[PDB]
Design a protein around this ligand. Structure first.
Ligand code: HEM
Length: 212
């Protein structure tokens, strides 16, 4: 069984749970505030910073390298633009770094530094969602918060180097399927993808509490 399929299958249940977190349920209904949106986007800034630091560390490592697509996929620059938009020019000392965000970052560094063969789980969980469902979330955000089609404040959700998210997704999955796989690696990769998803749920839980 192909890795791309094994991951989709292993995470379909937890994905249902993630969409139904209180924060995402409210987000999807069009009830996201600037305060709530700023918190989540600041937390992603930290998460994608860590993810992409570890990607760069492992770019030549054959357990990751076939997924090395910085120009197309990396979000850190986009998130910096969004931070300047939402938080102003002194955003680096305005933005929060919540405990659940720190916890996700920690696991990202553990994976990148000690278990790089699992980094694909984390890239899969974030980037493939951003290319799929994130495009729906973009539209809802834009409408909720009166964000302009010209894209300011939603750079995260915009992939100017990818013509067509569906075709790129199909390429990315094809390339995942070229990673050297043993039963050991495959089983732990799909476990770590479930952990990535839980880390996200835990963040959304935390943000919702901080908002109430
Ligand atoms: C309200 C919240 C969300 C909505 C409405 C949403 C919606 C979607 C939609 C419509 C797809 C495409 C499904 C398909 O192609 O059959 C998708 C795929 C994906 N989503 Fe989300 N999603 C949400 C939250 C999340 C979160 C929180 C994560 C991860 C942290 C995530 C990760 C993914 C991944 C990895 C895929 C790719 C599945 C695959 O093709 O293997 N989703 N989601």
């Amino acid at each position: 069984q192909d890795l791309s399929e094994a991951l989709k299958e292993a995470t379909k249940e937890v994905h249902i749970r993630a969409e139904n977190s209180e924060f995402m349920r409210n987000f999807q209904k069009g009830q996201v505030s600037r305060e709530g949106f700023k918190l989540v986007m600041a937390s992603l800034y930290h998460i994608y910073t860590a993810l992409e630091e570890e990607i760069e560390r492992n770019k030549q490592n054959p357990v990751y390298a076939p997924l090395y697509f910085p120009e197309e996929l990396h979000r850190r620059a986009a998130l910096e633009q969004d931070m300047a938009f939402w938080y102003g020019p002194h955003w680096q000392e305005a933005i929060p770094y919540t405990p659940a965000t720190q916890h996700y970052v920690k696991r990202l560094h553990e994976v990148g530094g000690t278990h790089p063969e699992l980094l694909v789980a984390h890239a899969y969980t974030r980037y493939l969602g951003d290319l799929s469902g994130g495009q729906v979330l973009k539209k809802i955000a834009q409408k909720a918060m009166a964000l302009p089609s010209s894209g300011e404040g939603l750079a995260f959700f915009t992939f100017p180097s990818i013509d067509n998210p569906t075709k790129f997704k199909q390429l990315y999955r094809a390339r995942m399927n070229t990673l050297e796989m043993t039963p050991e690696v495959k089983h732990r990769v799909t476990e770590e993808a479930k952990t990535a998803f839980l880390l996200n749920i835990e963040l959304f839980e935390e943000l919702q509490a901080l908002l109430t």
